[PDB]
Write a protein that binds this ligand. Structure first.
Ligand SMILES: [Zn+2]
Ligand SMILES: [Zn+2]
Length: 134
């Protein structure tokens, strides 16, 4: 809640860095030309954004899981090469679903947490979700 560098209240949010900082950090060279906001002034848009993302991710996950199940179902009836291909396919899908599970987990954590929980490093996860949807 307080800055380790300056001891002041961590109440500001930097748009370029997506970092939560104090007013003395904003005056540091590392935040030169950056635009800062009180965390209250930006919590809403990111709440909405992450909320929107979470839905999509959940949908994509359930789809991927059903697909994995179907792939698994084809395995026993398939000949050896196709078997192995299907096994690999299943594994890959598993990896994807694990990734989606991680992101979803993080999103719920952020959406149910404090503003600092919500905003600290949100740009990375937004990037990740953006890549995932692409
Ligand atoms: Zn500071
Ligand atoms: Zn900055």
């Amino acid at each position: 809640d307080h800055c380790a560098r300056h001891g002041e209240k961590l109440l500001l949010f930097c748009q370029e860095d997506s970092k939560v900082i104090c007013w003395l950090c904003e005056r540091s060279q590392e935040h030169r030309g950056h635009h800062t906001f009180l965390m209250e002034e930006v919590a809403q848009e990111y709440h909405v954004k992450l909320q929107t993302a979470l839905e999509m991710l959940r949908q994509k996950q359930q789809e991927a899981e059903t697909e994995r199940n179907q792939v698994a179902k084809r395995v026993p009836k398939a000949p050896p090469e196709e078997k192995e291909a299907l096994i690999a396919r299943g594994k890959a899908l598993g990896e994807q679903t694990q990734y989606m599970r991680e992101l979803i987990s993080e999103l719920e954590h952020r959406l149910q947490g404090s503003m600092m929980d919500l905003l600290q490093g949100v740009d990375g996860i937004i990037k990740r979700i953006e890549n995932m949807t692409l």
